[PDB]
Design a protein around this ligand. Structure first.
Ligand SMILES: O=C1NCCN1C[C@H](O)Cn1c2ccc(F)cc2c2cc(F)ccc21
Length: 490
């Protein structure tokens, strides 16, 4: 008997490698694809334009793909627990499918939806295609606790099966054949909203730096894996000036939103390795495996993104210092390297991993001694590839709050920028008021003589702030404070 299926998109914003959508379509007489947009989500959230644009473009891409099958995405406004009982009844739904969400809040949401579906006689299929592995199996093999160091994580997956292959494509004919009839007035209630409807400034015609959606994700995957980019990204990568700029081969926002399947990426990367080198080391997959590590650590920890009450997080007496945090968030620290990174982050929504180290170090144990929780929140607002798991996990790791086995130094907020882009042009690009400083002073403009500042038309303390801490003194004290925090545990 043919099902009437709803496939619910949350992440997994793609039709490729979508085993939950395959489950929705196989043996269905009727299929509808829904995204549930909480109309009051923004009331309690402060997420910025770049993330909203990326989401909306990802939904528009799905809707465009469905329109090729004479269908539409249904953008349903409400909260899932309110909406699904109505939808079930009004549409006569017999099956609901969705990609598994391992994050503690999503798991609790989904468990409630599954109870309500069971009560209503609705079958539920979930599939765990957001990650490479069954995170629960990793935890089970580790004595029902997540690994807290990367080598232990690697030991566990080394005695597990390999990640599932990407699921086969859903039949275009089958999905057009089983489509729900779209009503001509679909856009009264189910349309994808425009950015301007959300109060954002009018969008230009030119492309965003990071265009949302599955189509873009797959095009980028193809370029990413060209043999001509192999040496540059996998054989001999270098963190040079060009590396700081958003790359047309970058994949991390697409992986975070699910526009790109991590299993497809993993196996296409394996394929390219086998062609270039004729079994790869785990380090080939390091970007995905670190992501998987943080997902495994987060899934059973509802307080993962907080300090207090978080069983893996050392309790550190961070400073209450809202003024410093606001200067850090707005790129007004007076350290051009820090400020340029935070400006790039706000303007575009992505910054290099080593730039994340730099700014997180500066906020937390390196300089300002502000809680990593506040950095998580700013990255949640601005970073395209941030989610509950990798964002809090990375901040805890970087700040020596969790996963700690050994101390590692924070980069110098002057010297690291100097070394990464000796020309200073990264600074001139994102902080054009500093553009006239010669390269010798642009990363430390408070050290420029009065002559140089006048010729650069930028008087430090007036046109651009003085550095808000003495780094040498402050970092040495912060190191002593952290060492004591850890040594006294004994
Ligand atoms: O370089 C290494 N070594 C181990 C892992 N890793 C890569 C990091 O995960 C990169 N990264 C993030 C990725 C997504 C995100 F939302 C937040 C962060 C983030 C926060 C930080 F404070 C510092 C680094 C950060």
């Amino acid at each position: 008997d043919g099902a009437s299926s709803v496939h619910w998109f949350r992440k997994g914003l793609r039709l490729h490698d979508n085993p939950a959508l395959l489950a929705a379509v196989r043996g269905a007489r009727c299929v509808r694809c829904v995204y549930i947009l909480d109309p009051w989500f923004a009331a309690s959230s402060s997420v910025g334009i770049n993330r909203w644009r990326f989401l909306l473009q990802s939904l528009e891409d799905l809707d465009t793909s469905l329109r090729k099958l004479n269908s539409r995405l249904f953008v349903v406004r409400g909260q899932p627990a309110d909406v699904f009982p109505r939808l079930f009844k009004e549409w006569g739904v017999t099956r609901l499918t969705f990609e598994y969400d391992s994050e503690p809040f999503g798991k609790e949401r989904d468990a409630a939806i599954m109870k309500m579906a069971k009560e209503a006689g609705v079958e539920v299929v979930t599939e765990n295609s957001h990650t490479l592995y069954d995170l629960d199996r990793i935890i089970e093999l580790n004595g029902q606790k997540p690994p807290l160091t990367y080598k232990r994580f690697q030991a566990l997956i080394s005695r597990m099966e390999l990640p599932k292959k990407p699921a086969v494509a859903v039949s275009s004919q089958q999905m057009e054949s089983c489509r729900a009839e779209i009503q001509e007035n679909h856009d009264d209630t189910y349309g994808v909203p425009s950015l301007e409807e959300l109060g954002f400034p009018t969008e230009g015609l030119g492309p965003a730096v990071w265009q949302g959606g599955e189509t873009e994700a797959l095009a980028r995957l193809d370029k990413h894996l060209e043999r001509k980019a192999w040496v540059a990204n996998y054989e001999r990568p270098r963190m040079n000036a060009n590396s700081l700029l958003a790359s047309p081969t970058g994949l991390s926002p697409y992986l975070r939103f699910g526009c790109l399947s991590c299993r497809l990426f993993y196996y296409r990367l394996w394929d390219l390795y086998k062609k270039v080198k004729r079994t790869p080391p785990l380090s080939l997959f390091g970007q995905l495996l670190w992501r998987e590590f943080f997902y495994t650590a987060a899934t059973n920890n509802p307080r993962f993104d907080r300090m207090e009450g978080n069983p893996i997080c050392i309790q550190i007496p961070w400073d209450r210092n809202p003024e410093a945090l606001a200067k850090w968030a707005e790129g007004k620290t007076g350290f051009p390297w820090i400020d340029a990174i935070m400006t790039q982050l706000r303007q575009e929504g992505w910054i290099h991993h080593l730039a994340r180290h730099a700014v997180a170090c500066f906020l937390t144990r390196g300089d300002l001694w502000v809680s990593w929780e506040s950095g998580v929140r700013v990255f949640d607002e601005l970073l395209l590839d941030a989610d509950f798991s990798v964002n809090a996990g990375s901040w805890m790791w970087l700040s020596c709050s969790a996963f700690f086995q050994q101390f590692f130094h924070c980069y110098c907020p002057v010297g690291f920028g100097r070394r990464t882009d000796p020309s200073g042009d990264y600074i001139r690009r994102y902080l054009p008021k500093l553009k006239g400083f010669p390269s010798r002073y642009i990363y430390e403009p408070w050290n420029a003589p009065e002559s140089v500042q006048k010729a650069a038309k930028c008087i430090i303390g007036v046109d651009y702030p003085r550095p808000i801490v003495n780094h040498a003194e402050t970092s040495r004290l912060n190191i002593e404070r952290m060492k004591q925090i850890y040594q006294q545990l004994s």
